[PDB]
Scaffold this active site. Structure first.
Site, short mmCIF file in Angstrom:
data_model
loop_
_atom_site.label_atom_id
_atom_site.label_comp_id
_atom_site.label_asym_id
_atom_site.label_seq_id
_atom_site.Cartn_x
_atom_site.Cartn_y
_atom_site.Cartn_z
N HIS A 46 87.66 41.18 -38.37
CA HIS A 46 88.78 41.28 -37.47
C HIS A 46 90.01 41.78 -38.41
CE1 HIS A 46 87.57 39.38 -34.11
NE2 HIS A 46 86.85 38.57 -34.71
N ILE A 77 77.70 35.46 -41.85
CA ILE A 77 77.03 35.24 -40.55
C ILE A 77 77.90 35.63 -39.35
CG2 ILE A 77 78.05 32.94 -40.18
CD1 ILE A 77 74.72 34.15 -39.67
N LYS A 106 70.41 46.22 -29.86
CA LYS A 106 70.35 45.08 -29.29
C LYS A 106 70.30 45.52 -27.69
CE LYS A 106 73.21 41.33 -27.61
NZ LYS A 106 74.47 40.35 -28.24
N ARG A 142 76.85 42.19 -41.81
CA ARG A 142 78.36 41.92 -41.71
C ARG A 142 78.78 42.85 -43.13
NH1 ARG A 142 81.05 38.65 -38.85
NH2 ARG A 142 82.95 39.13 -39.97
N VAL A 166 95.47 37.32 -51.74
CA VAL A 166 96.74 36.92 -51.46
C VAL A 166 97.02 35.56 -52.16
CG1 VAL A 166 98.33 36.46 -49.59
CG2 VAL A 166 96.86 38.44 -49.33
N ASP A 397 89.02 34.76 -36.40
CA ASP A 397 89.04 33.27 -36.84
C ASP A 397 89.94 32.33 -37.00
OD1 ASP A 397 86.08 33.45 -36.04
OD2 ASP A 397 85.50 32.66 -37.99
N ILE A 410 83.19 37.65 -32.71
CA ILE A 410 83.79 39.23 -32.89
C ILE A 410 83.83 39.68 -31.45
CG2 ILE A 410 82.83 41.29 -33.29
CD1 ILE A 410 80.60 40.06 -35.22
N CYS A 611 61.83 58.42 -33.69
CA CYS A 611 62.53 57.42 -34.16
C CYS A 611 63.81 57.56 -35.03
CB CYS A 611 61.36 56.53 -34.83
SG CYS A 611 61.98 54.65 -35.50
N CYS A 614 62.80 55.30 -38.91
CA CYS A 614 61.72 55.79 -39.75
C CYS A 614 61.43 57.46 -39.60
CB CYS A 614 60.42 55.22 -39.70
SG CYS A 614 59.23 55.74 -38.37
C1 LIG Z 1 76.62 30.12 -37.50
C2 LIG Z 1 77.46 30.93 -37.08
C3 LIG Z 1 76.86 32.08 -36.23
C4 LIG Z 1 77.76 33.10 -35.96
N1 LIG Z 1 76.99 34.14 -34.86
C5 LIG Z 1 77.86 35.02 -34.42
C6 LIG Z 1 77.28 36.14 -33.72
O1 LIG Z 1 76.21 36.28 -33.22
N2 LIG Z 1 78.16 36.96 -32.81
C7 LIG Z 1 79.69 36.98 -33.26
O2 LIG Z 1 80.18 37.82 -32.74
N3 LIG Z 1 80.29 35.97 -34.02
C8 LIG Z 1 79.68 34.93 -34.54
N4 LIG Z 1 79.91 33.86 -35.39
C9 LIG Z 1 81.54 33.93 -35.44
C10 LIG Z 1 81.70 34.88 -36.53
O3 LIG Z 1 80.95 34.69 -37.74
C11 LIG Z 1 83.31 35.05 -36.78
O4 LIG Z 1 84.01 34.95 -35.54
C12 LIG Z 1 83.52 36.28 -37.42
O5 LIG Z 1 82.96 36.47 -38.75
C13 LIG Z 1 85.14 36.24 -37.97
O6 LIG Z 1 85.51 36.95 -38.84
P1 LIG Z 1 87.21 37.26 -39.28
O7 LIG Z 1 87.20 38.71 -39.66
O8 LIG Z 1 87.87 36.52 -38.36
O9 LIG Z 1 87.02 36.22 -40.40
P2 LIG Z 1 85.88 36.40 -41.72
O10 LIG Z 1 85.01 37.30 -41.48
O11 LIG Z 1 85.64 34.99 -42.31
O12 LIG Z 1 86.72 37.04 -42.94
C14 LIG Z 1 88.06 36.49 -43.42
C15 LIG Z 1 88.18 37.25 -44.89
O13 LIG Z 1 89.36 36.74 -45.26
C16 LIG Z 1 89.16 37.01 -46.97
N5 LIG Z 1 90.21 35.88 -47.70
C17 LIG Z 1 90.18 34.71 -47.40
N6 LIG Z 1 91.32 34.06 -48.31
C18 LIG Z 1 91.78 35.23 -48.83
C19 LIG Z 1 93.04 35.57 -49.73
N7 LIG Z 1 93.82 34.48 -50.11
N8 LIG Z 1 93.22 36.81 -50.12
C20 LIG Z 1 92.61 37.71 -49.52
N9 LIG Z 1 91.56 37.97 -48.90
C21 LIG Z 1 90.94 36.46 -48.51
C22 LIG Z 1 87.91 36.38 -47.21
O14 LIG Z 1 87.12 36.89 -48.34
C23 LIG Z 1 86.78 37.02 -46.05
O15 LIG Z 1 86.66 38.37 -46.26
C24 LIG Z 1 79.25 33.15 -35.89
C25 LIG Z 1 79.62 32.00 -36.62
C26 LIG Z 1 78.85 31.02 -37.22
C27 LIG Z 1 79.50 29.81 -37.91
CL LIG Z 2 75.18 37.50 -27.65
ZN LIG Z 3 59.88 54.36 -36.63
#
Ligand SMILES: Cc1cc2nc3c(=O)[nH]c(=O)nc-3n(C[C@H](O)[C@H](O)[C@H](O)COP(=O)(O)OP(=O)(O)OC[C@H]3O[C@@H](n4cnc5c(N)ncnc54)[C@H](O)[C@@H]3O)c2cc1C
Ligand SMILES: [Cl-]
Ligand SMILES: [Zn+2]
Ligand SMILES: CC1(C)c2[nH]c3ccccc3c2C[C@@]23CN4CCC[C@]4(C[C@@H]12)C(=O)N3
Ligand SMILES: CC1(C)c2[nH]c3ccccc3c2C[C@@]23CN4CCC[C@]4(C[C@@H]12)C(=O)N3
Length: 664
Positions: A46, A77, A106, A142, A166, A397, A410, A611, A614
């Site tokens: 995000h 994840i 997908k 990811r 940060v 998130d 996402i 493909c 491959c």
């Molecule tokens: C079990 C599970 C399955 C999921 N499956 C799906 C799915 O199939 N499809 C889907 O769309 N969503 C899915 N989600 C939700 C998804 O994982 C999140 O919504 C998504 O990864 C959010 O990303 P983000 O960029 O908001 O935060 P994040 O990807 O958590 O990124 C936060 C970032 O901030 C950084 N950070 C933290 N503190 C600091 C600091 N002080 N200074 C600098 N950097 C910092 C961290 O290193 C991290 O890189 C799932 C969630 C769970 C728990």
């Molecule tokens: Cl889905």
């Molecule tokens: Zn193939």
């Protein structure tokens, strides 16, 4: 384009650490700038969606620096993405031929509903994606998607600094364009922290809520929440022993049951690859996208691994997302030594179909480094009460989260990311063009719709999640009510009209259909009834009867009211044109095929004879989509013509909404 090995050689020439080779691709340079317009904390998906959309919406207006504490794009994840996300990628200049080299194909969502009290019984709900000449959806690793978006960002005037943290203790955030002083160090041990003077801070630190948690405590919804535990497994070439009839590995597959559900996602993994080498491979893919290289002349995934010295393999992401009111036995040491392992293997053997399914998959040890064979995360759903304020706002998130189911994380979360990206241009300019008190007031008022959207967004997603969960307790409610309503309310009507200019406005109107009134009316009747049956009991057959009849009665009127023409019987395997359930129906469109050589799933279109994974050449006839019911040559040509390129921005067009037409 001839491939360059710029970053691989730069890294070797200077013995550069991982974060140093990444930061050397910044336009401003490897070190932090003294000043920036926007500082983004966190380069998750995000944080990067935000920065790409902000710079593409209005180029060369905002200076943007993203601070990411990981030395390189780290494991996350959250791997399943949806048509709106692909459309966003395509609007930013990367279409399916190039994305498929990096990520898995997908083709829709399939659900299997396991009967608990009758082990072995199940029903299903199957949908499809789209022809290869319409669009694709993606299963993304990811660390690879964050790399792709980092490189794309740096190629568009955004600076991204990995291995920098940060410091939220010494950072100062103040309103009215007066000035933020963002403290950035390499960690708590760092003696020499830098400050970036800036106008706006964006909290994209995900669930950690590192900034907005200082403005409000985390909020939890009433009732049960969910836990998740998961691992990574081989991806079989031969899916024919999977115990579900008509199973296909290129869906996001859902194995559903009273306690929760299991995700199954087939996706390629680049783990083991050096970061510099991956930068060269990605950079080459973008140059190929820039040049418009056709899919058949673009090197296959495995060829890219050979070319750039990468590691490539197929893996399956399998995980449980279950309610946290489940009763576990006190002693679980027979199923493993870690809790995540224990609860996973315990739950697998509670269902004979899950054990039979899992017996097609071999566990991978520590795919993402030591300690990563198993993952557990407890109490998934939450909301941030305060998502903006003087000098800052939050996205992704950091605003809230519910559940993996239907991937709101996402694909819905990017409505906040992209809306905030668009809002950031006037926020910064207000601060530069008016005295402080009026600027702060005008910005606050500008952000009221963003705060109000966020406030109502997570509760609507929560009710959507509970709706599906309670219906997963019965093998008729699951497919014929919960899934049916999600796809009818949440199918992305008029997505072929979305462009960069309308994207945020369209995305915030989607919400997977969870705001649609008839959806919420059915969701509330089901939740109100089923939540009164204890989890360890079976739903009375009369309750299923009553709920099924209520849903079908609201459905017929809402379907008749929708003015969007869809070949519903071709898109949902179990339903006819009017979304009536058909007991034995099996006919649907066929958009994909599995490579006989490597097992990878492919999109059918005449100009993709080989493909993409491959490089094996399939026979020419196999590239033929099957439309059932059929389409003429003209109807097929008219379909593909609509989806070629997005329309130019017309400031007099009314935005057509994704949700179904109101009855009024
Ligand atoms: C079990 C599970 C399955 C999921 N499956 C799906 C799915 O199939 N499809 C889907 O769309 N969503 C899915 N989600 C939700 C998804 O994982 C999140 O919504 C998504 O990864 C959010 O990303 P983000 O960029 O908001 O935060 P994040 O990807 O958590 O990124 C936060 C970032 O901030 C950084 N950070 C933290 N503190 C600091 C600091 N002080 N200074 C600098 N950097 C910092 C961290 O290193 C991290 O890189 C799932 C969630 C769970 C728990
Ligand atoms: Cl889905
Ligand atoms: Zn193939
Ligand atoms: C809208 C679309 C992205 C979509 N969104 C879904 C949500 C849930 C379940 C299925 C879908 C689909 C399948 C669709 C239906 N459309 C028919 C004409 C073009 C298109 C686009 C695509 C198509 O070919 N397949
Ligand atoms: C509908 C509108 C009030 C609106 N509602 C939003 C909600 C969230 C984010 C953005 C918007 C916008 C911006 C819009 C989009 N419309 C295009 C044609 C006329 C209009 C009206 C206006 C326009 O010029 N700007």
């Amino acid at each position: 384009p001839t491939p360059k090995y710029t970053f691989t050689e730069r890294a070797a020439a200077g013995n550069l650490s991982d974060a140093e080779i990444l930061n050397s691709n910044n336009p401003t340079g490897s070190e932090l700038p003294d000043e920036s317009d926007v500082v983004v904390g966190g380069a998750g998906i995000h944080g990067l969606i935000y920065a790409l959309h902000a710079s593409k919406y209005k180029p060369n207006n905002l200076k943007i620096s993203v601070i990411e504490k990981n030395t390189r794009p780290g494991y996350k994840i959250g791997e399943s993405t949806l048509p709106i996300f692909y459309t966003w990628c395509k609007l930013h200049g990367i279409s399916a031929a190039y994305l498929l080299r990096l990520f898995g194909l997908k083709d829709g969502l399939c659900f299997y509903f396991l009967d608990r009290e009758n082990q072995g019984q199940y029903t299903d709900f199957c949908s499809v994606g789209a022809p290869g000449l319409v669009l694709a959806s993606l299963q993304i690793e990811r660390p690879m998607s964050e790399l792709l978006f980092t490189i794309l960002a740096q190629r568009n005037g955004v600076n991204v600094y990995h291995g920098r943290e940060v410091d939220f203790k010494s950072t100062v955030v103040q309103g009215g364009g007066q000035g933020n002083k963002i403290a950035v160090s390499r960690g708590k041990y760092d003696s020499t922290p830098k400050t970036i003077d800036s106008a706006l801070f964006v909290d994209a630190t995900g669930r950690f809520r590192q900034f907005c948690s200082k403005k409000a405590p985390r909020h939890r919804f009433d009732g049960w929440n969910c836990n998740a535990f998961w691992g990574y497994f081989t991806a079989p070439k031969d899916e024919s022993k999977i115990p579900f009839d008509l199973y296909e590995g290129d869906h996001t597959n859902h194995l559903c049951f009273p306690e929760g559900w299991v995700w199954v996602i087939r996706l390629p993994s680049w783990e083991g690859s050096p970061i510099a080498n991956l930068m060269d491979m990605v950079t080459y893919i973008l140059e190929c996208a820039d040049a418009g290289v056709p899919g058949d002349e673009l090197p296959s995934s495995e060829e890219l691994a050979r070319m750039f010295g990468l590691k490539f393999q197929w893996v399956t992401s399998i995980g449980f997302a279950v309610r946290n009111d489940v009763k576990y036995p006190e002693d679980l040491s027979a199923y493993g030594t870690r809790e995540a392992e224990q609860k996973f293997n315990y739950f697998v053997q509670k269902y004979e179909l899950l054990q039979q399914f899992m017996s097609n998959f071999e566990l991978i040890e520590n795919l993402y480094g030591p300690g990563t064979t198993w993952f557990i995360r407890k109490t998934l759903a939450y909301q941030s009460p305060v998502v903006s304020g003087p000098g800052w706002l939050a996205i992704g998130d950091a605003c809230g989260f519910t559940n993996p189911l239907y991937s709101p994380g996402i694909n819905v979360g990017m409505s906040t990311s992209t809306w905030a990206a668009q809002l950031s241009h006037p926020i910064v300019e207000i601060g530069k063009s008016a005295p402080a008190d009026a600027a702060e007031s005008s910005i606050r008022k500008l952000l009221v719709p963003y705060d109000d959207y966020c406030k109502s967004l997570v509760p609507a997603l929560e009710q959507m999640n509970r709706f599906n969960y309670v219906c997963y307790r019965d093998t008729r409610l699951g497919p014929q009510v919960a899934c049916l309503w999600q796809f009818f309310a949440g199918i992305e009507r008029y997505l072929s009209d979305v462009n960069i200019e309308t994207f945020a406005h369209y995305a915030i109107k989607w919400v997977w259909g969870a705001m649609v009134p008839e959806y919420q009316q059915v969701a509330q009747k089901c939740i109100e009834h089923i939540e009164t049956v204890p989890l360890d009991e079976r739903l009375p057959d009369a309750m299923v009867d009553e709920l099924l009849a209520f849903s079908n009665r609201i459905k017929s009127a809402a379907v008749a009211a929708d003015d969007f023409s869809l070949r519903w019987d071709a898109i949902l395997r179990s339903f006819d044109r009017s979304l009536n359930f058909v007991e034995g129906k099996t006919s649907r469109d066929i958009y994909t095929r599995q490579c006989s050589g490597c097992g990878a799933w492919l999109q059918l279109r005449p100009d993709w004879k080989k493909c993409h994974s491959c490089g094996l050449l399939g026979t020419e006839p196999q590239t033929a989509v099957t439309f059932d019911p059929p389409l003429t040559a003209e109807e097929e040509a008219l379909l593909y013509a609509a989806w070629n390129t997005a329309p130019k921005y017309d400031p007099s067009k009314e935005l057509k909404l994704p949700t179904p037409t109101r009855p009024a």
